Subunit: 420 residues, 3 copies
């Protein structure tokens, strides 16, 4: 019994998409046994830096006074200003409501005290079980930063993430701030020299290889500015060339590059203070061509890089593009991006990741994105259906599996939580 | 109470949008007592520069011969070329038809001579009353250029605008043509020197302050090229730093920057001769960061600048972004811009202004833009209702008021014409 | 006769007008069937279009070297298996292959690639051209004619003329972008260009242009240009354009077609599938339009990020005709946004699409896919003016549709289509 109309296709696709367990291959979450660095609950949702930026456009409260408030005072203020005093129509505010609803709380009542009561009853481990189930996420990739004292501790103590959580080695401080990070590496025993000589090359490689051994990361990642260039006679250029790319190749680990972030244009806003610019594609093109035995995962921040990044993926099979990152993570842009991407790459890409910083965001990030992606799929399958092609439900489930999970694991050359 | 259908939602949003009096916070209209610089009528609509550009793509008539023609002849040619010989499907041509319809004229007859008869029967003051009612526009912000001899006369004679019309001081000749303009300032008794010294600084400030006192402007405005940078050692860079910003901070008057116009790439087209380019955001970013006690209003001309402008608005609360300017003022682009803005800023922006150069254009500019903005709001409300939120009709009316009027007045730190009459 | 009473009735009228209108496809890589094997056709050529080579290389374990070592049939088999069977053929290029097979009466439901092949084995080139132009509703095809390609050159030198449905367009990439290498061939052909760019060099390059203009009767002369294109420029390209091409173009009243934004061979092993894109400066195009008002220019651009500003540049200059959704733009999401921006700012005074077809049958999908998108843009735009009180008539719809799909081009180039050249 064939799928022979758009109407039935819409049912089968929406269901296949809803039922597919997601691998979220870039997040800011942590296994619950790491302790308090895992953020969760309605106050954390309301104080997400996305909503700090937004509240500051309305409130008379100074940013100084805001940071001096408690977490609950901050959440109260953002609730009042973004939900009660104006309708919560932005993507970030909507996402808070999608989360409350998904947990079985009722946004109709606007009863924040009662929302808070739900979270006070649970342990972190319970809420992870709840959220992963509700979000239908089988596997989460963490962002693991050896230079963050608060996170390093857990690794140093012999803690392992539970099997649903995977490590990814974040290298920004090493690559973008080597002149400072130099001295931390020396204090940790990595005997880097003032000169970029064989000794410094071998000791930075050892630092990388030691952390790879300890975390077993799925990839190594870096955020890069719009002015990113390669090759480059800079600390960043030399490290990529001489240390990171050879180690990534040896271990068959992809190098993830998140390009286009301009750091701290409004420092007082903290995490809400970063900006965006369009990047040259030249450095990415060079890396792909001149390092055919390295694998690259790339996502870019500027709307204006998105089409050319898709074309670049047509050129190089060692590029996997992923996600609608940050300022790209808004319905209007997710839609145009996913359509361009599918049109020129078919199913050979990773449409989305959450970048979740608070546990419950998995619910809204995946619900909001799946609905858009489902609709793109329905359009694209219908177009071939009307061309005379038979699409089977098995084939849909396969394609959707590729998009939400298998493409990633196939590219990184490892197995998920269920397969292992 | 709460809404729970998309039927009922669409209705309530569309009615709220239609019923909300608009503040049009950037136009090229004037109070009717200013005389003939207020353009109106069907011949003015048809010879708007947007349509001169379009007709020049089709007609065998040279641009020279076109400017040699009378207004009625130009209008006649444009009607034949763009409406009769091809269907009037462009946004500008569509707009002409929306105006005629809104006035109660029937575009079905295509009877241009009959449309003309309507306008011959009325005064400027009558037509302004008619159009502001039909467009539901309560407040119009003008573009007032003290370097235009025609306009400067009225201000200097002591004419004050009708309470529905507000001043905005346009400074392009000062900031962008100082090499010529410095000599006019001198001729007006402002003792600017050849060097940029303390004397020149204080005299340019005095010019600004005299015009602020004369016009009571709601903001000071400049149009800027794609190559705009700040800081910069240039005439413009020094006037902004030394004169404009301190004067604007002292009086608490925003600085409006309309960025991305490349002037006169086709000189023979006149007003239709200007082009566009993408700007760097660096100068705007620097201004917002380093001048936190100044308020900035910004609109940009390049499609490729729109998303990063929204992000910049997320960084800086002294930034208010506004409108879909000029080449952006097209349904396809109004739609994508309004959606991005709302997704990232909620209701903390000004979605639209008209740039109306001819009075009747307020009808189409607002009717076309309101319909798109209403669609966007319905979608965003529907998304939060789907998430369990209950929207009330009063909350809708409030959101709509913010977007079409109150956001502007709150930002510029003044009252509109009705609140002024009350306060 | 009757008013258009509803959007539903509008839609059927527009879709009918669009479907019935014979297309002039003003830029293709097809040839008149009498040119011989250089006209590519059949399912194996469809499947090995370089768009699909790019896509199969993202999936398959087969090396690019091993791929090129395979026969055409083997290549087609791999591509079918990897992009149609192992994953759903949802990409625009893949979908296009299915639209083609369907259009020819070959049923994609069966996936019977061997039976599809049998269809093509039964026919001549000339029979397939008749079939495909009828099914695609294409009246007139404009070729890309390169005098430097020996494989094509031969047909011209043999005194062969294109079938009257096929029109010549003179491609000048090797002369303009590779002059220092091409000089030597010019000299072999008796064009005695000098080491210096002096009068003799100017006159001999002009003579080469004039010779080919007279041989091919081209409707325009064409070049593809990188994102770093500038004019004026003290380069071989800049000098040839200024001193030879613009003067000859003006004398003969032939437009100059520029396809801007291709970055050649960023992945050389992929061959034709190895080219990339960048955003260009508009300055060179602006300068040419302004400073050469007696020349006509046809422009299409490769970067998404140039599209809006190109439409604005058309508003400025009546000697600019913009055309098409080129290559990486030739994707429904992008065709839609482009056609909407264009019509919003230019009305009907542009050429919405061309196919760039490299394999004969692509005319079918390229025009079927594009016509559906353009029909829907037209429906939206007519509906908006009907809602403003304007009475659009069916005859006016057909007129506007004739303008967009054929007449705008023939009017701009100052020449007649095949049917009009028979009558005259
Ligand atoms: Cl751009
Ligand atoms: Na769009």
């Amino acid at each position: 019994m064939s799928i022979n109309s758009r109407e039935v296709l819409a049912e089968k696709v929406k269901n296949a998409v809803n039922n597919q367990p997601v691998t979220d291959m870039h997040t800011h979450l942590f296994s619950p046994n790491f302790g308090e660095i895992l953020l969760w609950d309605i106050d954390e949702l309301l104080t997400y830096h996305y909503l700090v930026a937004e509240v500051m456009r309305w409130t008379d409260v100074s940013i100084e006074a805001f940071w001096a408030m408690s977490k609950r005072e901050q959440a109260d203020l953002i609730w009042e200003e973004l939900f009660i005093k104006r309708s919560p129509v932005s993507e970030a505010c909507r996402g808070v409501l999608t989360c409350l609803q998904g947990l079985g709380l009722d946004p109709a009542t606007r009863d924040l005290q009662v929302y808070r009561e739900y979270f006070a009853k649970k342990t972190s481990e319970e809420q992870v079980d709840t959220v992963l189930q509700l979000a239908n996420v089988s596997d989460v990739v963490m962002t693991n930063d050896p230079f963050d004292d608060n996170e390093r501790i857990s690794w140093l103590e012999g803690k392992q993430p539970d099997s649903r959580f995977h490590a990814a080695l974040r290298l920004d401080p090493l690559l973008n701030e080597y002149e400072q990070t130099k001295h931390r590496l020396r204090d940790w025993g990595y005997k880097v020299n003032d000169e970029w000589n064989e000794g410094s090359i071998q000791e930075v490689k050892r630092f990388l290889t030691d952390w790879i051994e300890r975390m077993d990361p799925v990839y190594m990642a870096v955020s890069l500015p719009p002015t990113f260039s390669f090759p480059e006679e800079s600390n960043r250029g030399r490290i990529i060339r001489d240390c990171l790319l050879p180690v990534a190749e040896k271990h068959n680990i992809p190098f993830a590059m998140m390009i286009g972030v301009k750091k701290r244009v409004h420092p007082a806003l903290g995490d809400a203070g970063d900006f965006v610019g369009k990047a040259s594609m030249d450095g990415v093109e060079h890396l792909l061509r001149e390092y055919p035995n390295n694998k690259f995962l790339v996502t870019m921040l500027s709307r204006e890089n998105q089409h050319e990044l898709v074309v670049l993926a047509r050129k190089f099979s060692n590029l996997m593009i992923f996600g609608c990152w940050w300022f790209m993570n808004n319905p209007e842009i997710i839609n145009e991006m996913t359509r361009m991407r599918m049109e020129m790459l078919g199913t050979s890409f990773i449409p989305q990741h959450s970048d979740a910083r608070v546990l419950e965001q998995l619910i809204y990030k995946w619900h909001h994105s799946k609905s858009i992606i489902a609709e793109v799929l329905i359009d694209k399958y219908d177009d071939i259906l009307q061309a005379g092609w038979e699409v089977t439900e098995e084939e849909i489930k396969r394609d959707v599996a590729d998009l939400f999970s298998r493409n990633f694991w196939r590219f990184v050359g490892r197995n998920d939580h269920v397969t292992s």
